[PDB]
Amino acid sequence: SIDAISQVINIAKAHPNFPIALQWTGGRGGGHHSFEDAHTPMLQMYSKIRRHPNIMLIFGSGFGSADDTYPYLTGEWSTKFDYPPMPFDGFLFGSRVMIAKEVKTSPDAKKCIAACTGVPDDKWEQTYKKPTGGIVTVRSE
Amino acid sequence: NILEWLENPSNTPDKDYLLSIPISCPLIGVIQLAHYVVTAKLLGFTPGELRSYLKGATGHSQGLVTAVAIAETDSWESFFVSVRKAITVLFFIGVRCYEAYPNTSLPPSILEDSLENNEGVPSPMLSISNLTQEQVQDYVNKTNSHLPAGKQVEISLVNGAKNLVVSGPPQSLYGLNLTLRKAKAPSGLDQSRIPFSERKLKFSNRFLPVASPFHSHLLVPASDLINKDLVKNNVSFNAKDIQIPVYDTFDGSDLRVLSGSISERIVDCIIRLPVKWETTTQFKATHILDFGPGGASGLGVLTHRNKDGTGVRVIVAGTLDINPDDDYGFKQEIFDVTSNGLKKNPNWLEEYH
Amino acid sequence: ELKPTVILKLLKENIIQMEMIENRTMDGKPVSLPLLYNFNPDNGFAPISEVMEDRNQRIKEMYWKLWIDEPFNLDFDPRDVIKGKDFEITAKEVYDFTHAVGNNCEDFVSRPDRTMLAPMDFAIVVGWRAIIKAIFPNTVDGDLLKLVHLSNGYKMIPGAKPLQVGDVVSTTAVIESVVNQPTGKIVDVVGTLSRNGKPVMEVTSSFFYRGNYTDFENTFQKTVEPVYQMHIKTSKDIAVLRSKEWFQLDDEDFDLLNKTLTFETETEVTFKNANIFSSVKCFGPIKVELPTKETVEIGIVDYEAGASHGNPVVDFLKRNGSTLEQKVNLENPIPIAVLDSYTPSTNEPYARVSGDLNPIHVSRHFASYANLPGTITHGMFSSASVRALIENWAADSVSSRVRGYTCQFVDMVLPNTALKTSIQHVGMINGRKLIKFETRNEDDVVVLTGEAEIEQPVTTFVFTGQGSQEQGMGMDLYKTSKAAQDVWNRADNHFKDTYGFSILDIVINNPVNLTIHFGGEKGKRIRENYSAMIFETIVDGKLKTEKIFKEINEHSTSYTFRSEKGLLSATQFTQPALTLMEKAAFEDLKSKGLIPADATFAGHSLGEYAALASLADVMSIESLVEVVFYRGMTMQVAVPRDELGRSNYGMIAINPGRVAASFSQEALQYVVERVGKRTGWLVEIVNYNVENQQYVAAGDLRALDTVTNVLNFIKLQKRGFACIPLVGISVPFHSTYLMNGVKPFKSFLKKNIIKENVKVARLAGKYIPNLTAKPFQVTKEYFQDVYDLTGSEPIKEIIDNWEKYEQ
Amino acid sequence: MKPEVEQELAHILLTELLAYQFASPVRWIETQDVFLKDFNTERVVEIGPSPTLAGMAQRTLKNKYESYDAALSLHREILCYSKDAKEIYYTPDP
Numbered sequence A: 001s002i003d004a005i006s007q008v009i010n011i012a013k014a015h016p017n018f019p020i021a022l023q024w025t026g027g028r029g030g031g032h033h034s035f036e037d038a039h040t041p042m043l044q045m046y047s048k049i050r051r052h053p054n055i056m057l058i059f060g061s062g063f064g065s066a067d068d069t070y071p072y073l074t075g076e077w078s079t080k081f082d083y084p085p086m087p088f089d090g091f092l093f094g095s096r097v098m099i100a101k102e103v104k105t106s107p108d109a110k111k112c113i114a115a116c117t118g119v120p121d122d123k124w125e126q127t128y129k130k131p132t133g134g135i136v137t138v139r140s141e
Numbered sequence B: 001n002i003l004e005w006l007e008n009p010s011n012t013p014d015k016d017y018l019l020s021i022p023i024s025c026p027l028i029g030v031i032q033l034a035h036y037v038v039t040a041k042l043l044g045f046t047p048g049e050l051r052s053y054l055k056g057a058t059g060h061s062q063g064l065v066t067a068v069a070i071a072e073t074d075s076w077e078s079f080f081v082s083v084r085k086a087i088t089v090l091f092f093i094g095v096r097c098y099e100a101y102p103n104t105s106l107p108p109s110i111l112e113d114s115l116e117n118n119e120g121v122p123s124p125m126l127s128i129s130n131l132t133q134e135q136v137q138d139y140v141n142k143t144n145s146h147l148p149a150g151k152q153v154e155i156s157l158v159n160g161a162k163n164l165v166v167s168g169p170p171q172s173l174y175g176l177n178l179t180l181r182k183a184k185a186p187s188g189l190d191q192s193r194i195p196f197s198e199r200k201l202k203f204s205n206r207f208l209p210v211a212s213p214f215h216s217h218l219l220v221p222a223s224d225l226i227n228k229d230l231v232k233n234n235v236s237f238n239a240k241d242i243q244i245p246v247y248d249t250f251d252g253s254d255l256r257v258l259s260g261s262i263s264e265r266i267v268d269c270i271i272r273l274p275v276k277w278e279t280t281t282q283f284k285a286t287h288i289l290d291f292g293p294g295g296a297s298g299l300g301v302l303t304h305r306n307k308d309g310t311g312v313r314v315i316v317a318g319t320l321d322i323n324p325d326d327d328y329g330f331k332q333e334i335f336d337v338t339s340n341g342l343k344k345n346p347n348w349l350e351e352y353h
Numbered sequence C: 001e002l003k004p005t006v007i008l009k010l011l012k013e014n015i016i017q018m019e020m021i022e023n024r025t026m027d028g029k030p031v032s033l034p035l036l037y038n039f040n041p042d043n044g045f046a047p048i049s050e051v052m053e054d055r056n057q058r059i060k061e062m063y064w065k066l067w068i069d070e071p072f073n074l075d076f077d078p079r080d081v082i083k084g085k086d087f088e089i090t091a092k093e094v095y096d097f098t099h100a101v102g103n104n105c106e107d108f109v110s111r112p113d114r115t116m117l118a119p120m121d122f123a124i125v126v127g128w129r130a131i132i133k134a135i136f137p138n139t140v141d142g143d144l145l146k147l148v149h150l151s152n153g154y155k156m157i158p159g160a161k162p163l164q165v166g167d168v169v170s171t172t173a174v175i176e177s178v179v180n181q182p183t184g185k186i187v188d189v190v191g192t193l194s195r196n197g198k199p200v201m202e203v204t205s206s207f208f209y210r211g212n213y214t215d216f217e218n219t220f221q222k223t224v225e226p227v228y229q230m231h232i233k234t235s236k237d238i239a240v241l242r243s244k245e246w247f248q249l250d251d252e253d254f255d256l257l258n259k260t261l262t263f264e265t266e267t268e269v270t271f272k273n274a275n276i277f278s279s280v281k282c283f284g285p286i287k288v289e290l291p292t293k294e295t296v297e298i299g300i301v302d303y304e305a306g307a308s309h310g311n312p313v314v315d316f317l318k319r320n321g322s323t324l325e326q327k328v329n330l331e332n333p334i335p336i337a338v339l340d341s342y343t344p345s346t347n348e349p350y351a352r353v354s355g356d357l358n359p360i361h362v363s364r365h366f367a368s369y370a371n372l373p374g375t376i377t378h379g380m381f382s383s384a385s386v387r388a389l390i391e392n393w394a395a396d397s398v399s400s401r402v403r404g405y406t407c408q409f410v411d412m413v414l415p416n417t418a419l420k421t422s423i424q425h426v427g428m429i430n431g432r433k434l435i436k437f438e439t440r441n442e443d444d445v446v447v448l449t450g451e452a453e454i455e456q457p458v459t460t461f462v463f464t465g466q467g468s469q470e471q472g473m474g475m476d477l478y479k480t481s482k483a484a485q486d487v488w489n490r491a492d493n494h495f496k497d498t499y500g501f502s503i504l505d506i507v508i509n510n511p512v513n514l515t516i517h518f519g520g521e522k523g524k525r526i527r528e529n530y531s532a533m534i535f536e537t538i539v540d541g542k543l544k545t546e547k548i549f550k551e552i553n554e555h556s557t558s559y560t561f562r563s564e565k566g567l568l569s570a571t572q573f574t575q576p577a578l579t580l581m582e583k584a585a586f587e588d589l590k591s592k593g594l595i596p597a598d599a600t601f602a603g604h605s606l607g608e609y610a611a612l613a614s615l616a617d618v619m620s621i622e623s624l625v626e627v628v629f630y631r632g633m634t635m636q637v638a639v640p641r642d643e644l645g646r647s648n649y650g651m652i653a654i655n656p657g658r659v660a661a662s663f664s665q666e667a668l669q670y671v672v673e674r675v676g677k678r679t680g681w682l683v684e685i686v687n688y689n690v691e692n693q694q695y696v697a698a699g700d701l702r703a704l705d706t707v708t709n710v711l712n713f714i715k716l717q718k719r720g721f722a723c724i725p726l727v728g729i730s731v732p733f734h735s736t737y738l739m740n741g742v743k744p745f746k747s748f749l750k751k752n753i754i755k756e757n758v759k760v761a762r763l764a765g766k767y768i769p770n771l772t773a774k775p776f777q778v779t780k781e782y783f784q785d786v787y788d789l790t791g792s793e794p795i796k797e798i799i800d801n802w803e804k805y806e807q
Numbered sequence D: 001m002k003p004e005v006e007q008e009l010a011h012i013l014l015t016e017l018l019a020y021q022f023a024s025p026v027r028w029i030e031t032q033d034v035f036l037k038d039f040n041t042e043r044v045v046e047i048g049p050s051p052t053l054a055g056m057a058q059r060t061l062k063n064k065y066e067s068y069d070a071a072l073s074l075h076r077e078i079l080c081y082s083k084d085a086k087e088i089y090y091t092p093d094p
């Protein structure tokens, strides 16, 4: 969340020479997830993060191809929100590789994963209530 | 008697009388002109040379008059001519706009209700932050449907994407505030466990320290009076005299290319038309000097927040201080001779390309 | 600039003239007051004496030049009425006045789409000439330089609007009283400001000529006495009253016994000296209270006497009667605010705006000559400033709310002085708040006191109908309040005498059964009362006179009212009890001065009947409970019943927003309409209470049971779920079932509602009936609407013959 | 019209209204509209043993006049005689 990002900034400030990898992910990622939008917290905190050169900005939660990450690599994503371009330092792909040949997912599990169609970002919030794109949200212990 | 007040603070009128626009308009103009003078003088420059160093100039509502007057200056002899022009225009703006819509006492019950809810004293201008122009216009329309024509409110200053100001009668603005606080979540509400889409929008509102509804239909009757008076007082701005672009506050266009009277357009912009600050500021520049009042709370900091990450540096020439963030300069940066006098703000598209 | 203020020369060989000059005149030409002195060199210890002959005339001539723009003439009668010049109110004048007195109320500031009002204090500007011309006559002789303004007052005439720019005002002034006192002569003046021919407000100014006066042949006095009340109990009181020569009744055979009389008199006296009167005249009307609490004139007080030491009429009324006081004090004052105010540094602007060019406020030499502490600020400026404070705070800056304001000038005030006024809400008067104020200066000395009358915020009184009538309702007020006791005791006495039962007993104890015994002569009279009443009805356009209490005949020795859990739930006892509870509560409110005169009102079902008795006073208490008891008994016999007083019909409340979020009223009104039509029984909607949230249906208790089930089935697709049962109702009120009774009911009301007890002014624009949700008006459009919804023949006789009645 | 003829007509109108009221539906909706909007009302005082019409008026205000009341700055006050004695009588406790 925003407060977590502030805590990360404080850590990076306490050790200005040590590299810190700020892995940012929205609530739309796989597995354990939060309630946050993927874009608003970044639009709020990008400037504060770039105040500190030792922070490396990674973007994740929802990427699976060069086409959908290139706008974030060039920073052109933030212009759609009437902001200046805000390039990112890297990306992480969690769900995208779960059907890779070297992962230990069972073949039927791989087929099940592939059969999911997913949903665009503007509707990911419709997993708290019912299946959407083959995925749903449930509570842990 | 401003000299008497400056000499003896003990016999200076109270804050409210100073804040009345017939006082504060020319006084703020004088403050801006004095700051411009100090800068020039310290830099060992004439007003003409300093203006020649500028790519352009503009002003936020009342500041536009100072902008065009500064653009007029050529040397220390004609500077007093320009100053007289500017403060004449401001004096008459204050006088006629106070005559058109003078301030009147508000019922004490409303004052008490506003104070008891962490709200300010009502005034003719309300600042609403963290809301789009569409949302604020929606609330304004809702409020205005219930009100007669003469008491309607409107958006005056479009300061930013989330920064808007509504001008109108203090009673109407109070009613709008009631509507807004009926639709605002408490600041101390935790919504980290609620989905983002369903989260109740949070925002803030406050009344500006002003005493007249600028850029409002209420001051419209004073436009003709001001125009008729300035021709008698011998105040006029010629496009040839202006030698740097001065951007209109309604459309950001250059005033030098205006077909009609520049003074008429300036008064219209101040009293009638809204300020589209983002539209005005579309110019490309590396440094922006803020002479206006307010210091760290003035227009320079607002413009810096609007323009963050575009490689633009804001220097507030009116005050001396230290910014821990160092994101914008102070009076010293204008005169520093080391590299500390040349600070570039970050341009993300270029730094992290 | 520098100008000659005082000159000193020898107007003769032995006379010194000191010409004191006032330069701030109305025309700009200076005016000189020549003071003459004798110089006698023979008396070396005191060679200079003052020439007294005509000194007062010279001072009055100066002040006449300063104040009055008419030819100088002091020989006019103080008893006569002074007429003031017409005044045209302009925006400039209101602006100047408001700025001079520091009043920033928005009502007086020009704004778009709103005409600008003039402040109440502007009345002095309008009428000062007429008011001050009263103290000039040579018969009211005095030194104007020692004149002291004791107090000033404003008083809006009820139903008169505030002054507004564009008005033309006329002023008239009369001296109310001029009496000699040991410390000087007091002159009380009353001005009346009239707009368009109607009077708007009255100004009362009291002046003081300090000195020693003994010209009692020029003095007189007028006092409006407090209203005195007398309850004539015994024949002794009647005899004593008839002994007084002044007590004169037009109807010599009037029955004063057990009557309440009110005396409202005025005393006009002349004086022979400080202690004795040379003529006394007390006069006025005598009025008698009626069962409807309306007082009607029955005679005139008429006392005239020559030399006397007192007024015997007032003494008699004081000792035997009681005085009615309009003002009613709260048990504890409510502080409003303590405010800071400052006097201007110059008195000139207020003088110029008001026309009060008294030199003592502006001219140092005149103020020194008068032995004043300086150029004191005008008392009227202080009054206007404090009234502006009160209006801003006590009236929440609503100018029209201030109807009266009076101030007393207890001490002088100098310019540049910090004042501290404390404002308190202390009492009520006739529905208006009573505000007291007290203004002190830096030294903590009271300099100004007075009171204000602030109208309450726009009010509506709403009277509840039949519902959950609880045991003991209205009994706490009954214990504490005297007006409540009057209402309840009159009703209980009537019920005991007429029907052998106490309504108070039913309210307090709620018995399951109540037996009436017809033994003895009183029992036989009560039995006859029971036998007489009937339930007339219209069947196919024909009268059908039934009889309530068919069990009661001339051989009956008792009768028992029955119920299941208490008779307070029964209609005939619940309706009068609720009516009395509400009437008692409203009478208590009235007795405390809490009822605004313009309060609009309405009643929900039964409440309407109670509201009319409370605010319109159309019927006395005995008639009110009598008709409500008759109607309640009629309802019992309108529906078939059983033992314990039950019925087949019923009522339920319906929340259309509970069956579905999209179920409109017109949808429910459609379903219920069809359900009855599609089933042939009686069911409809009787009370539209809250939009799409509260509708009440009345009809067959079986049919209503289906209605809930159906809506319960509607709510199942695209107490009770949306139908709660309204306890306490056992008849289909407000339903087409009861349409027959409307004919007999109209006859019964037209009988009991007295023609002379209906005051339109108490109903017009205030009463909103349930039949037409429109304020009551005697107009063809109102009768047209009445006929439209519910055709009535007398109504259209009014319609079709309107030209005859209107003319 | 003359005051006497006016009184005669008013008596006829009042008798007719009272007679027909109990056999025709109660339009409390229009009445609440009238006295909350056409006159406005900063204090509505309910005279009765319980807050029935006070609750009705509070719901009507909550559902039909929130924006209008806020815009025109009305501090409406719904008081019932049964529960709101202090505000009716101006006797706030110390």
Ligand SMILES: Cc1cc2nc3c(=O)[nH]c(=O)nc-3n(C[C@H](O)[C@H](O)[C@H](O)COP(=O)(O)O)c2cc1C
Residues within 6 Å of the ligand: A025, A028, A029, A030, A031, A032, A060, A061, A062, A063, A092, A093, A094, A095, A096
């Ligand atoms: C199957 C799965 C297991 C995960 N396990 C962890 C974990 O153990 N610890 C952790 O911090 N994040 C875990 N994550 C979150 C990922 O590190 C990453 O934030 C997320 O997968 C990126 O969003 P995306 O799935 O839309 O690409 C997991 C994600 C998935 C899909």
